[PDB]
Amino acid sequence: TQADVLVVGGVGVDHIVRVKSLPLPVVDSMMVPPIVTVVGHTGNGVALGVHALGRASAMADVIGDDAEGRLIQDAYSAAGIPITFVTHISGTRRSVNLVTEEGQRMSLYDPRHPFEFIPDPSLWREGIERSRHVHVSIMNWARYALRDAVAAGRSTSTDLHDWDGVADYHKDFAYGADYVFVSAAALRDESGVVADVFARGRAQFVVVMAGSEGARVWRRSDELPLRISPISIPGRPVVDSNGAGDSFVAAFLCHYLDHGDIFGAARAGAVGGAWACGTLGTHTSFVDVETLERLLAR
Amino acid sequence: LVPRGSHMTQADVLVVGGVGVDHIVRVKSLPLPVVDSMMVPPIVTVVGHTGNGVALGVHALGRASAMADVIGDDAEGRLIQDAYSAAGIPITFVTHISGTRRSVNLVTEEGQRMSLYDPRHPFEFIPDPSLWREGIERSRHVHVSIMNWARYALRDAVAAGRSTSTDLHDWDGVADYHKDFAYGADYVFVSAAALRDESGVVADVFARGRAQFVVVMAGSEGARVWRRSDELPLRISPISIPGRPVVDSNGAGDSFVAAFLCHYLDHGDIFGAARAGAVGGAWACGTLGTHTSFVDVETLERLLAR
């Protein structure tokens, strides 16, 4: 097999509960509509996003030998998407997501796996070799997969999410990947952290994702960021800003591996992000090629 | 119609309906902290306590319990089956396309519990009546959870000459949904929590129903038992067990019922059956979780005699 983008880590299972309002009314118990179990989470989005754009994605991760684990397996099977895994006693990552009619989406994340577990590198090595780009989730063990992906001469990316710019946990990913993505939300002195990443890391550029006010792209030796205005899709207004980041990354990677322009890949990402934001956290939806091209041309 | 375990031997207590699967989430506080997302310790999936607690309590006391209910042909369904098999408790079920009943339960360190319940099954649904009828023939007593279709199981059990019980839980004494159960069972259990005018509701229950007595559970202040003749309630103080202080009182009611039923079916004395019920209740409260541990015979007798 051969993949455009290998995703390492992050697959999990979401249990979605529709509630009247957030904050929750003050009661001992309340009846809710059917609670759906779906595949969701941070890494799963990039793989599905890549696949939706007609590129070949794949996944390497640690799941559980449990019902949710088999659920993930079968779900990946239904798509054209190869998945390589080992199982650990602690079981599959899972979440409960509280969503409302509004779109405000509370998420209770269960990381599940022991922090200090490190799998046999056989989990990622064949994938890395059969893959063109490797996107690496900040699962604690995946830091060694990142190591290998660089060593194998594949281009790498990673998504730091809410990182404050000081914490040591993220630094290996921040300093070890070619294309680094991070949320602006927890970023005290953006330009400082960015400079630090260039000082101490191998990053070719850094994409900051600020949601509402779009995204900023920092490159080496540019004192100023390319500013990317957020994108509005007629008929598909913002309803849920949860899950945008993975759709942004997926589209960025697909465009960039195709065309090679950082500026244009950033706008592709912005479209992808906007598309996810216009989707109801009840159904899974990723921009396809036809729509991306249409919107990008505008 | 699918029977697991010994769907052959006589049962002391058949439980009808109520089983589901709980996803238990341990959270920082109720009301919830203000965030898009926070992380929690591992989320455990277990069988709930609603029908399951009573069956377990009865079995724990060395009596033969059994379950008849509607589950889904899904993973939560298979968990329920395997869980009953591991516990040694026969279960008979049918499956429905809407799937197994499930909940997400939000609990904190205090004990404050919030349940988000997904019943799945259609309100007006009624399973194959063979589901409870076959149980009724092989069972001595029938305890009926307030599933909507279970009202018809209750009728059939009375008609068949079985003694019946039910747990109305938090009933206001006004809602019409519960009345078939309130007026239709021999032994009625109800929570005080939502009871506006207890003595009124009790009087109503004896006037319009076949109940021999009404047990009102009140947690902190114990339990009150009303009989037909007696104009006054029998009051049963809560019970303190040395070495087992109170840690979690959720699910206690199920244990009260299981122990009450086991004693009463043997001796027939209501006052003592109530005290057995209190011991069962006290035991459950000293365990963390809703259906974690049930008093056995040796311990009931020991504590009951003291």
Ligand SMILES: C[C@H]1O[C@H](O[C@H]2[C@H](O)[C@@H](O)[C@@H](O[C@H]3[C@H](O)[C@@H](O)[C@@H](O)O[C@@H]3CO)O[C@@H]2CO)[C@H](O)[C@@H](O)[C@@H]1N[C@H]1C=C(CO)[C@@H](O)[C@H](O)[C@H]1O
């Ligand atoms: C995917 C997840 O990434 C981020 O979480 C990471 C933390 O920032 C790190 O501190 C580290 O957490 C570990 C801690 O060192 C320690 O407390 C230990 O108990 O283990 C923790 C994890 O086991 O690593 C975390 C990644 O595992 C970020 O903060 C978090 O918000 C991210 N998850 C959300 C993302 C999305 C969308 O991408 C939602 O769909 C998910 O359900 C959220 O959980």
Ligand SMILES: C[C@H]1O[C@H](O[C@H]2[C@H](O)[C@@H](O)[C@@H](O[C@H]3[C@H](O)[C@@H](O)[C@@H](O)O[C@@H]3CO)O[C@@H]2CO)[C@H](O)[C@@H](O)[C@@H]1N[C@H]1C=C(CO)[C@@H](O)[C@H](O)[C@H]1O
């Ligand atoms: C066991 C359960 O009993 C009670 O819930 C019942 C309601 O009180 C009934 O009114 C009826 O609800 C139906 C309504 O008529 C209507 O809204 C319709 O749309 O369908 C509703 C669902 O059938 O039936 C309910 C049971 O199905 C009681 O109020 C409730 O507290 C009980 N459930 C929780 C109780 C405990 C403790 O026993 C929690 O720990 C459990 O996890 C909850 O499931």
Ligand SMILES: Nc1ncnc2c1ncn2[C@@H]1O[C@H](COP(=O)(O)OP(=O)(O)OP(=O)(O)O)[C@@H](O)[C@H]1O
């Ligand atoms: N309300 C919005 N309007 C327009 N675009 C949005 C909106 N929210 C998000 N986006 C798009 O999604 C991208 C990232 O959004 P955001 O920064 O909110 O993700 P995030 O919260 O970092 O994701 P994660 O859950 O991975 O942390 C932005 O670049 C933006 O283009």
Ligand SMILES: Nc1ncnc2c1ncn2[C@@H]1O[C@H](COP(=O)(O)OP(=O)(O)OP(=O)(O)O)[C@@H](O)[C@H]1O
């Ligand atoms: N804190 C406690 N101390 C002593 N006994 C208790 C305590 N809580 C409950 N019990 C015993 O359990 C019985 C039921 O209490 P309670 O009314 O809280 O049940 P419930 O919450 O209605 O049950 P469920 O949660 O199944 O609906 C009481 O009659 C009491 O004897």
Ligand SMILES: [Ca+2]
């Ligand atoms: Ca990711």
Ligand SMILES: [Ca+2]
């Ligand atoms: Ca992000």
Ligand SMILES: [Ca+2]
């Ligand atoms: Ca329950």
Ligand SMILES: [Ca+2]
């Ligand atoms: Ca019950």
Ligand SMILES: [Ca+2]
């Ligand atoms: Ca009760």
